[PDB]
Amino acid sequence: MRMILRKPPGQRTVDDLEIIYDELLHIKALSHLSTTVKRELAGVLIFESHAKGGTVLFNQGEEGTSWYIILKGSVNVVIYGKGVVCTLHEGDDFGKLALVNDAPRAASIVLREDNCHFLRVDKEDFNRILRDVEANTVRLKEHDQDVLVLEKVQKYTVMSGTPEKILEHFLETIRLEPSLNEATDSVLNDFVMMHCVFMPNTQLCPALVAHYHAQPSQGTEQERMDYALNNKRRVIRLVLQWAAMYGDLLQEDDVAMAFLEEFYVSVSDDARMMAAFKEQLPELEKIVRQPIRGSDEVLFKVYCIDHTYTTIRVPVAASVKEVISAVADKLGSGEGLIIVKMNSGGEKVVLKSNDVSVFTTLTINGRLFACPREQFDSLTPLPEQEGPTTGTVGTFELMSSKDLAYQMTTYDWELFNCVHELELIYHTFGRHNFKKTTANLDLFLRRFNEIQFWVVTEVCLCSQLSKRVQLLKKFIKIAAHCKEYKNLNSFFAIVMGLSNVAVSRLALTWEKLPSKFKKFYAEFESLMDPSRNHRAYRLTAAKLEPPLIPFMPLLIKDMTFTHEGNKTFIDNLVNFEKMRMIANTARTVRYYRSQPFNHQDVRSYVRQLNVIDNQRTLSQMSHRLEP
């Protein structure tokens, strides 16, 4: 029997094969496989035996060349820097992951006891027989806990895992070969971007240092020297990707800057001494409207009930509690203050001490108030908040529709490029959880409302019906030119401004509009059809090439539902399936900005819009234009 299985695959008789197959039916590790598959394995499965305990089947870092099943005995799964991570027993299988992902061995396998028997299947045999049929989930275990979970979604990808093991996985799988620069960065990008949710810098940085200085516990001197050197090369690669992702945002993180500054010293010292990192050291040396920073300071006005105000000087990323404190300093009081946002329409919201960077989360005409709780219901809006009372048609009517739309898209692009990829992550998972600002996103998202209300304001302040028809005509043109420049955001903003109840009511204006522009708008309104998950817009945006501004409210919707529809943690492990989904959405924004974009009087108007955002006021103005 042992002899039969010890024979080379090509030297097995028909009767030998029949005997082997019958035995394979008793092996429970193979029971999920078919009859067809099992008899193919009969002429391929190699019986391996080792007598000495402590014998090494394979080492960490080596190429995956075999899959094993334990017939008799047990093995230690050994990882550098943590020793025996778990033990596998009779009936267990190992070695699948490295083989299928064509990745290095993540661990060593060492014989736990004397006299062990194994069934082995080599790589080319595994790939033609078992590759797409042995689809068992790979569950890496440490201390009888799941630590990494991988599945076929064709290679195995991380579904869930601990922050530490996820990092260990993405480190080991880095390929340093220059021809794989793009592929390596793409694989790391999910972790690099999404780590702030599950493994913040306060943990990640110490971990990166530990890995950089990690040494192998096995091998000849040269074997060990080479492993450690490449381990160091991989950690530098990840740090470079990590540093690139943050960019200017590192300045906001003292822990991250301290780490990077010291990491550079480590690497430069090691480069000199080991005669290595010739390509990577210079890259790391480089790293050691304008986007608003969280450390930047604002002079913000906080209003009392009698409409007097305090000017405070605080960081942009200041918490509500920090704002309350700054107000209490200048008013010289300790009498239970709350911060409340107020609309032009009188609608009030109490802010929580927890909330950070609230200044840019106000409405277009919103103001910030400080008062004791007893005053909350008596608060009334400032006259400043109610917007203009006479139009500006006399100014922008004299301006080309093409010039207006162009200066809009120019300004929209400056605002859109100020938004950092990470601000989308911070906004979705909640600002307080990161204590970071999303001021750039806040202001760019506000701009959609600004444009929308600009339209409604100018129409409602235009009393001459003849000129009001000329207005509707002009906005439709501005919208059409925006859709041409691929600024879909401003396009939809104008369209939705026209769709506003105050504007859609004006039948005598719409009827007197040429049917050429009536049909234009009806087509514009159909591009807004929420039917089949905004299919009308989604197909439109898909057709377009890189340099484009997407429909922002829909992006914010996608992000919100990805977050609420999926759990962050599954079985106390990071749901990395969710992490990828969020990262994909952010990369779509990256794709929209992958290419650049191709009259000071028009510029100044477009960038200094004065708007009514009070719907009640706009409805009342509309009603006395056309009763």
């Binding site: 109490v350 109840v501 807004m528 998950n533 529809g565 989904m581």
Partner: protein
């Protein structure tokens, strides 16, 4: 073919309810970027148009209000604020499509937790009424059943 709209303030449970109805949390991953994300056959097809995540964009709710046929005015029973925010939304529906009568339902979400309760059953009843819970899957399906009847 039907189009139901979910309305209410932020942090109420609009999105949780939406996902819990059309598919369910945890049991399957939720992808909100595909065609079928908000459509569920029930014996007729329903699209749920939810204003969750887009509350700051007033134009978004209006667009949904225009295309809507059924309306869910959801409020948290741990928040006094959310109940008082409903009167305005009720009115805004009767303006975009321009009528007198519109099929709708009041919804009191988060009923499972009552050690943080501040609103009562009393008040909602005074204003169709359901005390549902998205996370505990109480009345989740019922909410959207009443609307197709109306």
């Amino acid at each position: 073919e039907y189009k139901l709209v979910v309305l209410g303030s932020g942090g109420v449970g609009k999105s949780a309810l939406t996902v819990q109805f059309v598919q369910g949390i945890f049991v399957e991953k939720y992808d909100p970027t595909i065609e079928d994300s908000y459509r569920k056959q029930v014996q007729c097809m329903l699209e749920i148009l939810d204003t969750a995540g887009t509350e700051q964009f007033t134009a978004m709710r209006d667009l949904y209000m225009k295309n809507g046929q059924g309306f869910a005015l959801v409020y948290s029973i741990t928040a006094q604020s959310t109940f008082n925010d409903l009167q305005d939304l009720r009115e805004q529906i009767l303006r975009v499509k321009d009528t007198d009568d519109v099929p709708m339902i009041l919804v009191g979400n988060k009923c499972d937790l009552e050690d943080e309760r501040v609103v009562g059953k009393e008040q909602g009843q005074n204003l169709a009424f359901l005390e549902s819970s998205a996370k505990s899957k109480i009345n989740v399906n019922e909410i959207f059943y009443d609307l197709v009847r109306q």
